[PDB]
Amino acid sequence: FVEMVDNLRGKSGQGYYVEMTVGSPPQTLNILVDTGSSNFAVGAAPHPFLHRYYQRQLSSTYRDLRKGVYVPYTQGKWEGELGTDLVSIPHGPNVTVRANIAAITESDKFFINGSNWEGILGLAYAEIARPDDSLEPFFDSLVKQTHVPNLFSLQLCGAASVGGSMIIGGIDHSLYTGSLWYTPIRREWYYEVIIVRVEINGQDLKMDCKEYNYDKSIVDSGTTNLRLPKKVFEAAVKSIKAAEKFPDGFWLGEQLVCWQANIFPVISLYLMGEVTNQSFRITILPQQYLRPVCYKFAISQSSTGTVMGAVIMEGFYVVFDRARKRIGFAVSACHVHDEFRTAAVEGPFVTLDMEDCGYN
Ligand SMILES: CN1C(=O)C[C@@](C)(CCc2ccccc2)N=C1N
């Protein structure tokens, strides 16, 4: 799939985007790749931060759905008008599908000033689509209208500019080393998974595993940080500082920390495996959670559950195997390492009562 290799670009902190075309004749747009939502939504009016925007009036294949959507978040919000149109991915499979598109007509704290993308491709499931689950997500339309196999994979490489690969409909073995290990998608809404154990520096947190997934744990290409429930976060900071100059605000991501150009440990998440009582672990390095910015501590707290963002994903090739309701992780070919260590994916381990780790 050398076709699709290196089809992702971006800037540090501003997400990964893929080029797409919309409409007839095709309009080129850069589109944020987001496994944490399910709407395909594109700027459709000259907001001054945008390099480009969807112009429905130019498209002979546009169809108005005559319904608007209001989409607020914790930070920003956007509003738009729903329609369908023909959509392609030039450095993707060789097909053209009719898909839902939200023409964004008004937004606040959503688009990034200085960024080079103009829309968002929500790759998760219909259940969290707005305004509701009848609004078929793009990838569902893609698979339903073509012979493209029902899976995609992401290699996020993070270098100011970043690159990566989104292999649509398959897997490229050049993008990873060692073996793929799979964890069950617990429910098709977000890409939800279950953390059964957490280690730092090899020693374990010894918390009720339910604390790792309150009230969910997801895989999200649209988040930068590893985001942990507060309880989990504090223990992780304790263990990590243990492995100095520790201003409290820094851990709270309230301030920045500057060193000059090992006292930080590896971090292992054990994920629910495919077989009863079997799990595996993925291990990241400080090079994943210390983000060159004066590095920012890229582990943060949340109230939405655990989120495995780019801090987790830049260490791994991640396979979103929707056909088999599962997500695979393998050591990424592009991840940043030493001559001493690497990120790791290892198994099998024996972990009992894994179902109990899921909040409900
Ligand atoms: C974490 N997350 C959101 O808060 C909602 C969205 C839709 C925001 C995507 C976004 C927007 C601007 C910059 C980065 C990511 N997707 C997410 N995955």
What element of type H or E holds 19? strand 16-22
Distance CA 317, CA 157 (A): 9
Name 4's bridge partners: none
- Amino acid letter, 237: V
Is residue 129 assigned to a domain?
yes
Whichever domain contains 249, its CATH number is 2.40.70.10
Which residues does residue 17 pair with via DSSP β-bridges, in sequence order?
9, 32
Residue 116 C-alpha from the chain's centroid: 18
Say yes or no: 34 and 124 in one domain: yes
Dig out the tokens for 317 from the structure: 């090739």
**Amino acid at the residue 100:** N
Q: Is 358 in the pocket of ligand 1 (CB under 6 A)?
A: no
Domain contains 6: no
Question: Residues 32, 120: contact at Cβ < 8 Å?
Answer: yes
Report the separation in Å between the CA atom of 124 and the middle of ligand 1, taken as the mean of its atom positions: 12
Same domain, 210 and 113: no
Q: How many Å separate Cα 286 from the centre of its chain?
A: 19
Structurally, the chain folds into a number of domains equal to: 2
Same domain, 139 and 202: no
Range of the domain at 52: 16-148
Give the CA-trace dihedral at 335, 336, 338, 339, to 10 degrees.
50
Query: From ligand 1's centre to the CA of 204, what distance in Å?
Result: 31
Same domain flag for 338 and 206 = yes
Question: Dihedral sign, CA of 208, 268, 200, 299?
Answer: negative
Which of 34, 35, 49, 108 is the pocket-test mutation for ligand 1 (most atoms within 8 Å of CB)?
34
Question: Do the domain assignments include residue 195?
Answer: yes
Question: Which burial class, exposed, middle or buried, applies to 92 when counting CB atoms under 10 A from its CB (0-12, 13-18, 19+)?
Answer: buried
Question: Does one domain contain both 102 and 59?
Answer: yes
Alpha-carbon distance values, 277 to 106, 213, 214, 349, 350 (Å): 49, 18, 21, 8, 6
Experimental method: X-ray
Distance of CA 33 to the CA centre of its chain: 8
List, as one string, the DSSP characters of 265-309. --EEEEEE-SSTTEEEEEEE-HHHHEEE--EEE-EEEESS-EEE-
In a domain, 3, yes or no: no
Instruction: Output the CA–CA distances (angstroms, integers) from residue 176 to 148, 181, 262, 328, in the order listed.
Output: 22, 12, 25, 11
Examine the domain organization and report whether 102 and 189 are in the same domain. no
| φ and ψ of 68, to 5 deg | -105, 155
Distance CA 81, CA 102 (A): 6
Residue 7 lies in a domain: no
**Number of residues written out for the chain:** 360
Contacts of range 65-68, beta carbons closer than 8 Å, 24 or more positions apart: 65/100, 67/131
The angle subtended at Cα 236 by Cα 231 and Cα 261, nearest 5°, is: 140
Integer Cα distance of 324 and 321 in angstroms: 6
Q: Is 80 near ligand 1, meaning CB less than 6 Å away?
A: no
**Domain-located, residue 1:** no
Q: Determine if the peptide bond prior to 25 is cis (ω within 30°).
A: yes
DSSP E strand boundaries for 35-151: 40-43, 63-72, 77-88, 97-108, 119-122
Are 271 and 316 in the same domain?
yes
The domain boundary, picked from 103, 123, 148, lies at: 148
Residue 213 is which amino acid? N
Atom of ligand 1 nearest to the CA of 111: 12
The two three-digit tokens of residue 38, written as one number:
């399910």
- 271 and 167 co-located in one domain: yes
- In sequence order, the β-bridge partners of residue 267 are 200, 284
DSSP helix/strand/coil, 156: strand
Task: Identify whether 64 is a catalytic site residue.
Answer: no
Residues 130 and 165 in one domain: no
Mutate to test the pocket of ligand 1, among 223, 306, 320 (most ligand atoms within 8 A of CB): 223
